[PDB]
């Protein structure tokens, strides 16, 4: 699971 | 929340559900939060850093379900969105703490009830010892690979991990600081996950329910040697104190 499915990257543009 | 159990807002009446309105009208879930006073919700800066504009956001209290109304809920605009000036992230999110001043269209803050109550902040630098069982709450993923969030609120129990244990290379190495708290399951079978960020880590500290942590980051979810990492609230009291007068 890439960083965009982790806690910390919610509501991020790159995701 | 990986594993654990389903619940309702009566079992975590300070829980705030934070949504963002998109340019087009569609509303999506962002993060959880904790009501610390009638007009103030506390959450994580990383939930908002990419879209720091207060007008985009909607905050619910007394809500047990994700995409349907809970009887007795209250809806709020964000009068002020305050992010921590010293936020930074690598893998570790530093100073991961935010404040949302809430106000209804009628101009009112939170009215306490059976489904809406505040959570006490901890005393400064006063945290429970390692191995203490604490609870976490959120609408976050039930599995790392899930595409959807659960419709029903969930909670689970994780155990506090010493800075020394979490410091280890085969854990998080240098990524974890003294301003962060690690917590996990002994079997790694239950954890917070994507969507749980900003939500409460609550511990029973000398008799009272206390907001010990804010869900912040982690490497995957319910993964061996990779605990959940939480913003250590008792290290941010002066920051919370000054900014809650804004």
């Amino acid at each position: 699971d890439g960083a965009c499915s982790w806690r910390g990257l919610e509501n991020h543009a790159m995701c | 929340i990986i594993g654990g159990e389903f619940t309702t807002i009566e079992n975590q009446p300070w829980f705030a559900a934070i949504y963002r309105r998109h340019r087009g009208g569609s509303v999506t879930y962002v993060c959880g939060g904790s009501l610390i006073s009638p007009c103030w919700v506390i959450s994580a800066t990383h939930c908002f850093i990419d879209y720091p504009k207060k007008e985009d956001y909607i905050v619910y209290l007394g809500r047990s379900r994700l995409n349907s109304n809970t009887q007795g809920e209250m809806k709020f605009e964000v009068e002020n969105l305050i992010l921590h000036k010293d936020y930074s992230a690598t893998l570790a999110h530093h100073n991961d703490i935010a404040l949302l001043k809430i106000r209804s269209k009628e101009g009112r803050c939170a009215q306490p009830s059976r489904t809406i109550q505040t959570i006490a902040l901890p005393s400064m630098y006063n945290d429970p010892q390692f191995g203490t069982s604490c609870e976490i709450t959120g609408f976050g993923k039930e599995q790392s690979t899930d595409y959807l969030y659960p419709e029903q609120l969930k909670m689970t129990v994780v155990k506090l991990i010493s800075h020394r244990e979490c410091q280890q290379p085969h854990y998080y190495g240098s990524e974890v600081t003294t301003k962060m708290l690690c917590a996990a399951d002994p079997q790694w079978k239950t954890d917070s996950c994507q969507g749980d960020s900003g939500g409460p880590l609550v511990c029973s500290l000398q008799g009272r329910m206390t907001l010990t942590g804010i869900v912040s980051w982690g490497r995957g979810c319910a993964l061996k040697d990779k605990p959940g990492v939480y913003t250590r609230v008792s290290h941010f009291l002066p920051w919370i104190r000054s900014h809650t007068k804004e």
Side-chain angles (χ1 to χ4, degrees):
Chain A
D1 274 275
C4 281
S5 69
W6 303 342
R7 289 159 294 187
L9 284 184
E10 290 90 343
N11 191 35
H12 275 242
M14 79 176 203
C15 295
Chain B
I1 303 282
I2 315 296
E5 62 209 60
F6 287 100
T7 186
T8 49
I9 200 69
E10 291 88 346
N11 302 324
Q12 200 82 173
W14 44 89
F15 181 80
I18 309 170
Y19 301 75
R20 184 165 71 89
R21 209 188 295 103
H22 284 68
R23 34 288 134 104
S26 66
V27 183
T28 64
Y29 190 69
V30 171
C31 278
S34 306
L35 189 74
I36 51 162
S37 89
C39 308
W40 293 95
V41 165
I42 201 170
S43 197
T45 283
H46 86 254
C47 295
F48 311 102
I49 192 69
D50 281 8
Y51 305 91
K53 228 108 76 144
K54 60 178 171 55
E55 292 87 8
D56 303 333
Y57 295 95
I58 312 154
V59 176
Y60 291 86
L61 299 174
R63 202 168 164 106
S64 293
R65 290 180 64 69
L66 220 215
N67 291 296
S68 75
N69 305 302
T70 302
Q71 192 167 65
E73 73 182 27
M74 286 196 288
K75 185 195 190 172
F76 300 94
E77 282 174 301
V78 178
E79 195 188 337
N80 306 101
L81 181 52
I82 300 161
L83 309 179
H84 198 292
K85 225 99 67 49
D86 304 309
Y87 172 83
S88 66
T90 179
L91 172 50
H93 292 67
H94 292 237
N95 300 294
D96 203 10
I97 191 167
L99 283 161
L100 299 80
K101 190 168 196 181
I102 49 165
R103 208 185 91 118
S104 67
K105 276 189 173 167
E106 300 78 35
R108 199 46 219 145
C109 301
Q111 300 177 42
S113 73
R114 202 169 74 185
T115 60
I116 308 161
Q117 294 284 308
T118 66
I119 183 76
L121 295 164
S123 300
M124 57 169 180
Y125 295 81
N126 193 350
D127 301 322
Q129 78 163 59
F130 72 97
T132 298
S133 298
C134 301
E135 67 189 33
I136 41 174
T137 307
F139 282 114
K141 288 185 183 170
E142 297 197 76
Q143 296 185 279
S144 293
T145 54
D146 280 3
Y147 191 76
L148 296 157
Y149 292 144
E151 265 301 301
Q152 190 72 37
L153 189 55
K154 292 189 74 190
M155 61 187 297
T156 195
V157 168
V158 290
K159 294 188 174 198
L160 267 22
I161 288 165
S162 77
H163 178 67
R164 308 98 264 182
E165 188 184 337
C166 208
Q167 226 180 16
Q168 288 174 284
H170 82 290
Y171 275 58
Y172 282 132
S174 62
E175 290 170 335
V176 51
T177 64
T178 51
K179 277 183 179 181
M180 297 172 194
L181 262 163
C182 296
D185 182 73
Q187 289 258 21
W188 316 96
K189 80 188 189 298
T190 189
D191 202 351
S192 55
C193 202
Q194 204 245 243
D196 293 314
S197 287
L201 173 88
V202 173
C203 310
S204 173
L205 189 55
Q206 297 206 20
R208 179 144 276 265
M209 298 280 274
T210 302
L211 183 79
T212 298
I214 297 162
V215 186
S216 173
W217 65 276
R219 171 182 228 276
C221 319
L223 246 185
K224 193 191 176 195
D225 298 341
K226 309 291 152 191
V229 190
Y230 300 77
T231 303
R232 201 175 189 176
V233 176
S234 67
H235 279 50
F236 287 90
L237 300 188
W239 185 89
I240 293 153
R241 194 165 299 112
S242 60
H243 288 95
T244 45
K245 285 133 74 181
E246 301 196 344

